């Protein structure tokens, strides 16, 4: 079962928030694809 990425804090850069969006999409892909 994949490791959930932590949301950045209040002071995050757009770089950190966009990186988070990609990590969250990767996590949710692993969650939804795992059983196949």
């Amino acid at each position: 079962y994949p490791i959930k990425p932590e949301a950045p804090g209040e002071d995050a850069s757009p770089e950190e928030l966009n990186r988070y969006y990609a990590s969250l999409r990767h996590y949710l892909n692993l969650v939804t694809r795992q059983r196949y």
Partner: antibody
Amino acid sequence: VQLLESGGGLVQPGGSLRLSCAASGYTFTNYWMHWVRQAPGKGLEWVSNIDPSNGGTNYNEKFKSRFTISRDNSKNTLYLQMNSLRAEDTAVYYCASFAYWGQGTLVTVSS
Amino acid sequence: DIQMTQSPSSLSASVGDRVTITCRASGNIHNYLAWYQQKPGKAPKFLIYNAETLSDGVPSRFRGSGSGTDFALSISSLQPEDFATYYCQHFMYPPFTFGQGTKLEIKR
């Protein structure tokens, strides 16, 4: 991304074969890994699966007494250990994980 | 065990046709359904998972719908490479059983 199968071929009834499936291109713990077979001219039949993140296994109870699924995370390899093979086990055996299928290997069980 | 009933077992159709294959689970599988295409002497190809999600590189003319026990695969406009055998498979609880398959052949 590929699953590459090895180990099929001809075995006498009551004999043993080990199939293997080498995965490449992604983290080996991402997806459950399944074995599926297809007798000549027939449909797909689900055999077993393993979760490489924790070794959890499911078996088609039809094969539970005779077949053992395993993997080695340090080799990116899935195994199926088939004991006490019978003529009715003649089939193409596939490994499958998410969108990735092995090429299949023909296992013939005959005298 | 949950069994999958696929219909029809064979379909004669033409390039351009809209076609539908159905798959009914004997128990609730939520959306844990995959569709596969298989051609003679080839490994199955994974088309759709979670009932409706297209796998990478699969053409948009393939669509899946369903939830619970009632599922369907639709091809909006058959192309020559679409004549093949189709199977559904559930991933709810083991055994992860397949439909018995639909053979999609060319009408003449």
